[PDB]
Design an enzyme around this catalytic site. Structure first.
Site, short mmCIF file in Angstrom:
data_model
loop_
_atom_site.label_atom_id
_atom_site.label_comp_id
_atom_site.label_asym_id
_atom_site.label_seq_id
_atom_site.Cartn_x
_atom_site.Cartn_y
_atom_site.Cartn_z
N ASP B 288 0.89 -1.19 0.00
CA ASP B 288 0.00 0.00 0.00
C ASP B 288 0.92 1.24 0.00
O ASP B 288 1.84 1.38 0.84
CB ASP B 288 -1.05 -0.12 1.10
N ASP B 290 1.04 5.14 0.57
CA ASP B 290 0.38 6.28 1.19
C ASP B 290 1.29 7.54 1.14
O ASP B 290 1.75 7.98 2.19
CB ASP B 290 -0.04 6.02 2.63
N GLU B 292 1.61 11.16 1.03
CA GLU B 292 0.80 12.33 1.36
C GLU B 292 1.61 13.61 1.19
O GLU B 292 2.34 13.98 2.12
CB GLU B 292 0.30 12.20 2.81
N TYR B 367 -12.13 11.58 5.03
CA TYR B 367 -12.19 11.93 6.45
C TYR B 367 -11.17 13.07 6.61
O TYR B 367 -10.48 13.36 5.62
CB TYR B 367 -11.91 10.77 7.38
#
Lengths: 538, 538
Positions: B288, B290, B292, B367
């Site tokens: 995965d 991620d 950011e 979110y």
């Protein structure tokens, strides 16, 4: 600021002072006595300043110290006392010390200092007694009872004994030295495997597997250094520090080497190997000498000599002199005892009035008087006295005791024997006036483990019902079961005969009672031994 | 006759293919990949003929063979597959073979093949579901939740998930490469300890202690090679072979290295370290990513570039090409997924319509829309839609989904996010018409672990009683609690909003739901995620 807190690395935490090699069958390679255990620890500092000095603490006392030169370290040091310790790693700098959480390590010794007490509940009909009479209460535990009989150290009603004798430790030697072993299959060969590379006349362990390697309650982990009988004896000693555990050297098939001890070279070699054995196996409290018998008439018809009595007396003075030295070096009290024949003919061969000065206790084998070894002469195998029908009976407990007292042996040294088994015959015929004992047999009774011998437990369990008549002879002070149909007849000790024997000891001021062998009792015999000597119920 | 029966000697029975050094803090020294475990056995022949050839059998198949030249022996051989085996030693001669009783040995692998299934009962309000919808149900497990939060792998309601993401795996690199870590005390220094001697741009483990060394249920023995999170993840995989466990690379403070991957030398180095990581840690099912965020606006204000979108797309094609090779070498299916920003402004920066071809799932972080990071602009942190009072709200789940669909991303690839925590403000004032959200805050709510953030569990537990008003906004499809006296206001997801999100996925044909972070839920959120997607109650 003070160093960060170290984390003990995962690793072995069980070390040994006396090490047992796990792929060794010869006594000489199986055991290694070191002066101290070699301990090792590693740590990781996951967070923080590593300090400037690393310390290993055992119960807050420094065991190792060194420069802290990184995030991980390893310390190697020696621990010379067995026990369980709280080990911590501390990192220090000028601002302070930071100690890790404690990790317990185990340093094993033959002391049993690293073990948890083997404290088991009493089984079968055993009842609790307090050892307050001050009389000896003894019994033998047999090394091989761990197999078929399946009676392990955890089953011994230990609080009901003062003395535990371990049968049997052998003396190394091949052809000519240990021929009696040959009558038992694989027995002679097992001793030669155990004694490979070891000198004749030195003590060894017969079955190292049962003695040290068989997993038993309390010593079941792969890495426990001591398992088997020895390992559970160490633990039992943690639980009952007052029970004297004596190795018994000799017995019926292991007595041959004593007959050569007239040669001092051989005797000194033997005495030195026993000192070494007691320094190796610290839970033992002295030595028991079961020489069957000075003068001959044991398993081997080719041994026996008139010099035997003299060698016996010298052997006891010399063992005593080495036990006296050992005692003062260690600060413990070592006992010197001996199991001897109760027959007046064998007693006459040794100067017990002289030998008694080196001995703590004399275990009088007042059992085996009669058996399936004689089919023509039937009698009470362990009676106190002579039966009504044969008042001149030679083999009696009192004849045994009287022979020693006559020699000048002090009464207090004498420990009377009780049997936890019966001996019997089949096909008893030609008896008169209803005493099967006046007849003749045609064979040995069907036994528990072997023919002619029956465990008390089984006598108590199966032969006190059915066709089995029961009679308590109150003159001899001995019971017997008889099954008229087959002529099966069994002589044994029961709670009443044991009581008779117990009162006798008290009256005559003898030393206590001992029995052969604990595995065979259901508790009736031991209860009675304790009760009859005046021990309080616990 | 056939040889006597050998006795396996007491010894170590746990070996490892991939070994972990126990006094090593640097990733490079902590792990050793071997081709096979090195196994060793010893035996004693207590009784009998030693035979002529000794054999070691693993499940009745020969692993070693050699001359039987004595009473004891030792065999050393290699085992290349993890598992638990029944090992026997057999002695053979022309008359036959005699095999020892079997001893089980453990050959550890990162497969978890040597472990017993970690199969734990569901806790708190978790209820059992069957994974029959065919929708993804995911959640993140955080490496550091094992400390203060005390939420260990054994507490994960594993049967209620299809996918488990492990947060977070770091990329090595010091000054300039990982400056965002510096905002978290000791975090930057822990990565430099773990990465000592390892090249920048290679993956590592942040906290090797929590990951591999902390004793946890099922991996508590000193000699278990794998403990901590990894060890329990291996076991959980034994118990749930269908749960996909994906390492998450990146996150808020671990994203800095991606910004340099425009240099292919660095990118190839990164891609090769991930291949190696998956070959080292076999229980992982893909990777995965991620990052950011491509374009900047993550923790570091100095990073972000317009090239980011291109490097992102190349990174995904290249990871995919290495996962495709790995799949065919191993016969397994590896998944390539990515957690991305739900803001249209960040989505616009990457060509997802192109990147989607290399990806199995896109975890849309719907979110964190609003929080205590903004005290002036209050809103629903995870709503599906815009509130009535501000219909043009930018940050919405649907705005997120619409932006991707607009790019041409297939709906099926999109996994919608749900929050298992709420974000809040204190001192909300100047709100109009009773909507606290129209006011302004003065600070962040008192949080569970940290200010401005609250675990759902605690919201559910303490803030749905007392002065706390509760309102379910049915336009936005979001709940909120408000305590007028202090102006405390919290935005979160509840079982109803999750249901709204679950039906949305079904209606729009999206891929499933995922949440951040499982430790924070009491079961209400996960139950609702499962229920809303149409999974059957078990």
């Amino acid at each position: 600021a003070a160093p960060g807190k170290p984390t003990i690395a995962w690793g072995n935490t069980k070390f040994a002072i006396v090490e047992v090699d796990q792929a060794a069958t010869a006594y000489n390679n199986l055991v290694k006595v070191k002066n101290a255990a070699d301990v090792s620890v590693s740590w990781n500092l996951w967070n923080g300043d590593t300090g400037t000095t690393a310390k290993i603490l055992l119960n807050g006392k420094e065991a190792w110290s060194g420069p802290s030169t990184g995030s991980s370290g390893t310390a190697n040091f020696k621990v010379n006392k067995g026990g369980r310790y709280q080990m911590q790693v501390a990192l220090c700098n000028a601002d302070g010390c930071t100690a890790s959480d404690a990790t317990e390590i185990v340093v094993a010794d033959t002391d049993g200092s690293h073990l948890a007490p083997l404290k088991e509940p009493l089984l079968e009909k055993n009842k609790p007694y307090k050892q307050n009479s001050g009389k000896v209460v003894g019994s033998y535990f047999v090394e091989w009872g761990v197999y078929g009989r399946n009676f392990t150290v955890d089953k011994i009603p230990a609080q009901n004994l003062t003395h535990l004798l371990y049968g049997f430790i052998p003396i190394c030697g091949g052809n000519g030295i240990n021929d009696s072993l040959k009558e038992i299959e694989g027995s002679f060969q097992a001793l030669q495997r155990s004694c490979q590379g070891r000198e004749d006349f030195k003590i060894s362990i017969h079955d190292p597997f049962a003695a040290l390697q068989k997993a038993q309650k309390g010593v079941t982990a792969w890495d426990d250094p001591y398992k088997g009988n020895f390992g559970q004896l160490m633990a039992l000693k943690q639980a009952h520090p007052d029970l004297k555990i004596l190795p018994s050297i000799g017995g019926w098939t292991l007595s041959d080497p004593f007959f050569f001890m007239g040669d001092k070279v051989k005797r000194d070699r033997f005495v030195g190997s026993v000192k070494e054995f007691l320094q190796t196996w610290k839970f033992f409290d002295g030595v028991d000498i079961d020489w069957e018998f000075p003068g001959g008439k044991g398993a081997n018809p080719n041994l026996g000599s008139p010099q035997d009595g003299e060698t016996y007396v010298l052997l006891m003075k010399e063992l005593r002199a080495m036990l006296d030295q050992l005692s003062t070096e260690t600060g413990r009290k070592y006992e010197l005892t001996s199991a001897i024949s109760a027959g007046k003919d064998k007693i006459d061969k040794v100067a017990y009035n002289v030998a008694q000065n080196s001995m703590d206790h004399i275990f009088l084998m007042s059992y085996d008087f009669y058996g399936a070894f004689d089919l023509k002469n039937l009698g009470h195998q362990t009676a106190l006295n002579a039966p009504a029908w044969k008042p001149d009976t030679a083999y009696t407990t009192v004849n045994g005791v009287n022979a020693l007292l006559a020699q000048g042996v002090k009464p207090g040294k004498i420990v009377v024997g009780t049997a936890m088994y019966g001996r019997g015959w089949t096909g008893v015929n030609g008896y008169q006036n209803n005493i099967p004992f006046t007849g003749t047999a045609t064979g040995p009774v069907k036994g528990t483990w072997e023919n002619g011998i029956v465990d008390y437990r089984q006598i108590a369990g199966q032969f006190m019902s059915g066709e089995w008549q029961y009679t308590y002879d109150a003159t001899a002070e001995a019971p017997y079961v008889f099954k008229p149909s087959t002529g099966d007849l069994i002589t044994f000790d029961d709670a009443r005969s044991v009581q008779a024997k117990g009162k006798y000891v008290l009256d005559k001021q003898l030393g206590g009672l001992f029995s052969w062998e604990i595995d065979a009792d259901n508790g009736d015999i031991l209860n009675s031994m304790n009760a009859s000597l005046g021990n309080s119920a616990g």
